[PDB]
């Protein structure tokens, strides 16, 4: 067993194995995990030894993206897309985010007790990515379904529960596949302010691209859209019920908010580690990785690890430095943070702008996704007070 609380709360593991071993082989999951800062630093900077390749018989759409290809592709695709996603290029959009905002918080203006997962952080997002894809937010619960399957952890660590988890994800990377491919012969005639349009405009200009190649990103944005700064958001609203001191004073210091949000991807990080294959034997802080073995950084524990962040276990809205690897770190790291921390502030500053003396609801209950690439919550019941 673990606990929903435990599953929620893997910190005094984390800590455990930083002050004994950080790098170490588990033998059940066949994986080096590796927990102090300095190893999840050294693991995601090096991109030609720590191969983001994941291989499987037959590749995915999703394994030609971005994330799943190394150097020197990588540059080239990243290249094609960098632009689009400045901070000065997300700026445009808070405008668009505030009136989603308020849009939403309406909807539910009726209701005294409300999910700040499904009425607001779950929507909001997803309503940004469906406009910046140019894609129908009527197929919002479609785009749902798909995203939780591809994200989903397995209940048990039985096998017959492992290999049907596995069909599901194949069958929805098919149909997301299939639904993309849609999308591209409908913007191949009539292309639109978007960012599907603007690769299939760079792919008639001679870009050296692949209609797989724009599908495949085009679904690592969807499922970003619909399973990351949702959590980023809820996160920040479950800290700060956690410790009413620290919503207090963002209350009297509105400034904070900002580095609130920087904490809470510390303290409550919507990825607590990621995966890498090794390409060739290292030596990593003493131990021996060799060539096609898995690693899991765990960016979740570096968070914690106390050489770099002084009282590590204390989230502290006013935190300086934080230097943490929320968004990862190296030719990798999160395209969609500037719009992950404007789309946060907004909806964040809106909500304790209106409902201070917000508190949980007697219906609240700890629902933490059954995940190990997203680490959220699947509702945040709260009461609004006023
Ligand atoms: C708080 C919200 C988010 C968090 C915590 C987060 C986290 C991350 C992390 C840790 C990585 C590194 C992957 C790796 O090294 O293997 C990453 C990559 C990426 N993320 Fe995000 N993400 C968030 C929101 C978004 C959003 C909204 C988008 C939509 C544009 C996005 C798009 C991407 C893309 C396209 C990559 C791949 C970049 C590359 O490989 O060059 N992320 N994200
Ligand atoms: C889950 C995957 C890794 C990781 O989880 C991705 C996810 C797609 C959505 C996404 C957007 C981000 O900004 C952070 C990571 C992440 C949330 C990917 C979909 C397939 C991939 C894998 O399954 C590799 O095994």
């Not at 995915?60 to 632009?83: C, F, Q, W, Y």
């Not at 999308?183 to 008639?204: C, F, H, M, N």
């Not at 690897?325 to 190296?330: D, E, H, I, K, N």
Request: glycine letters at 4%.
């Amino acid at each position: 067993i673990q606990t929903k609380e435990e599953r929620f709360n893997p910190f005094s593991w984390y800590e455990e194995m930083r002050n004994t071993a950080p790098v170490q082989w588990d033998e059940e999951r066949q994986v080096w995990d590796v927990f102090h800062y300095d190893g999840v630093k050294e693991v995601l900077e090096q991109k030609n030894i720590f191969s983001s390749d994941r291989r499987p018989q037959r590749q995915t759409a999703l394994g030609t993206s971005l994330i799943n290809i190394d150097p020197p592709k990588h540059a080239e695709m990243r290249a094609l897309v960098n632009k689009a996603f400045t901070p000065k290029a997300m700026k445009a959009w808070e405008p668009k985010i505030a009136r989603i905002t308020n849009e939403l918080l309406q909807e539910v203006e009726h209701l005294e007790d409300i999910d700040i997962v499904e009425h607001l952080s779950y929507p909001l997002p997803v309503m940004v990515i469906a406009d910046i894809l140019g894609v129908p937010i009527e197929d919002q619960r479609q785009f749902k379904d798909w995203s939780d399957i591809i994200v989903a952890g397995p209940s048990n660590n039985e096998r017959e529960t492992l290999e049907k988890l596995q069909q599901e994800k194949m069958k929805a990377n098919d149909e997301l596949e299939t639904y993309f491919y849609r999308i591209i012969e409908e913007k191949r005639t009539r292309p639109g302010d978007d960012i599907i349009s603007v690769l299939l405009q760079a792919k008639e200009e001679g870009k050296q691209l692949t209609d797989e190649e724009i599908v495949g990103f085009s679904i690592l944005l969807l499922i970003a859209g619909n399973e990351t700064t949702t959590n980023l958001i809820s996160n920040t609203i479950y800290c700060l019920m956690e410790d009413k001191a620290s919503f207090e004073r963002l209350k009297r210091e509105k400034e904070l908010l900002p580095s609130g949000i920087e904490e809470v991807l510390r303290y409550r990080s919507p990825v607590q580690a990621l995966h890498r294959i090794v390409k060739e034997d290292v030596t990593l802080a003493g131990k021996k990785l060799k060539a096609g073995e898995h690693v899991v950084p765990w960016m979740g524990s570096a968070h914690r690890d106390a050489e770099y962040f002084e009282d590590p276990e204390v989230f502290k809205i006013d935190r300086k430095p934080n230097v943490h690897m929320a968004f990862g770190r190296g030719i990798h790291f999160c395209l969609g943070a500037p719009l992950a921390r404007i789309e946060a502030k907004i909806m964040l500053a809106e909500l304790i702008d209106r409902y201070p003396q917000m508190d949980w609801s007697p219906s609240f209950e700890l629902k933490p996704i059954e995940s190990t690439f997203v680490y959220g919550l699947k509702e945040l019941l709260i009461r609004k007070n006023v």
